[PDB]
């Protein structure tokens, strides 16, 4: 009844401020921490900050 | 009869606030969400936030 989708493509130069939301305290409105179903395309190529 | 054009060149340091419109809730007057035909030159060099 209450589910929010999230589509994102992990790149080699992607930053954590774009997947979960940028900080100001972190503007995470509609991203990953508040999403029922998340989709991450191509996970075998992200940076070390996203894997941590 | 009612079509708005949009010419933009994607750069390596481009920000989403210049393509879709800067926020104040987002001043998207004449950008991409309200445009019939959009043009993006050199798409193989944009940032990860605008590509997603």
Curated annotation (Swiss-Prot), chains A, B:
Induction or repression: Part of the ravA-viaA operon, which is under the direct control of sigma S in aerobically grown cells. In cells grown under oxygen-limiting conditions, expression is largely dependent on the anaerobic transcriptional regulator Fnr. The operon is coexpressed with multiple anaerobic respiratory genes, many of which are regulated by Fnr. Levels increase toward late log/early stationary phase.
Origin superkingdom: Bacteria
Subcellular localization, as worded in the UniProt entry: Cytoplasm; Cell inner membrane
Inactivation phenotype: The double ravA-viaA deletion mutant shows increased persistence when grown in the presence of fumarate and kanamycin.
Family: Belongs to the RavA family.
Self-association and partners: Homohexamer. Interacts with ViaA. Interacts with specific subunits of the NADH-quinone oxidoreductase complex (NDH-1 or Nuo complex), particularly with NuoA and NuoF under aerobic conditions, and with the fused NuoCD under anaerobic conditions. Interacts strongly with the inducible lysine decarboxylase CadA/LdcI, forming a large cage-like structure composed of two CadA/LdcI decamers and five RavA hexamers. Does not interact with the constitutive lysine decarboxylase LdcC. Interactions with ViaA or CadA/LdcI and phosphatidylglycerol are mutually exclusive.
Function of the protein: Component of the RavA-ViaA chaperone complex, which may act on the membrane to optimize the function of some of the respiratory chains. RavA functions as an ATPase.
Name the record gives this protein: Regulatory ATPase RavA
Organism, scientific name: Escherichia coli (strain K12)
Gene: ravA
């Amino acid at each position: 009844q209450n589910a929010r989708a999230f589509e994102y493509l992990m790149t080699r130069f992607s930053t954590p401020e774009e997947v979960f939301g940028p900080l100001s305290e972190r503007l995470t409105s509609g991203y990953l921490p508040e999403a029922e179903i998340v989709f991450l395309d191509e996970i075998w190529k992200a940076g070390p900050a996203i894997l941590n």
